[PDB]
Amino acid sequence: MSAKELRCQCVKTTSQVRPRHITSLEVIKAGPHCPTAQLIATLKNGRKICLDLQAPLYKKIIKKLLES
Amino acid sequence: MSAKELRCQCVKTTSQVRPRHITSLEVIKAGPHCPTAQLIATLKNGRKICLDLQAPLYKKIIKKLLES
Amino acid sequence: MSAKELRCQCVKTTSQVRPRHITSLEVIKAGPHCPTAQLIATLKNGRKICLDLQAPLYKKIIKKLLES
Amino acid sequence: MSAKELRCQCVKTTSQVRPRHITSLEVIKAGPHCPTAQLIATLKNGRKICLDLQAPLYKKIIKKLLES
């Protein structure tokens, strides 16, 4: 009914990183081990941080991808 | 050829698939081998099709991920 | 020695899952946030667990991918 | 039991790239759209090429990931 916690280190949001030289990002919804919305990303230096979906921060990312 | 046809496997858009029962999707911008905007996706049956970014089709996907 | 617990959900090994109806699997080396060897995986039910690289468990996976 | 016109993101093998400063690589078996073994990869410059599974080329990659 209302699962909580399980296997998602991307809890809350890793917005500590800033959007700009991004390359690609994944977006998984709240699955089983992840009852919360989970979004991970990837930079130009093939590494992956993670952002949220209910914030204008990642909207600057997708918006930066629509620009082209 | 002035940014056109390089090594991208999903040209135009693979909208032949319908939204819902999805799991996660990739969002890559127009890189080098892919001068065009490229977006891939993933379904419940761990497979991957691909959609576009300038259309309301994938907007139904992200919107389906925000409703939660 | 290099870094200590930064961004790795696959600590030790998630071998609780058994190999068989797999689809694809990732394998990242020990980066910065992940000084430990880290590899994730994907099943038929588009989900992702994670295994190790110094064990015969994932070798049954790659071996199952070579048989074809 | 059916193999006709499908969509492999990488036919044959993109060995044109050399192994060395890699970051992570995908390993998907012969799915439906891809009845052939399909393996993709990722470099330090977050990009993705693709290699094979029945060759010692990618074995140098996994071997380089085990050395650690």
UniProtKB/Swiss-Prot annotation, chains A, B, C, D:
It comes from Homo sapiens (Human). The chain holds residues 39 to 101 of 101 of the full protein. This is Platelet factor 4. The modification Phosphoserine is found at residue 24. Heparin binds at residues 59-65. The gene is PF4. Disulfide bonds join 8-34, 10-50.
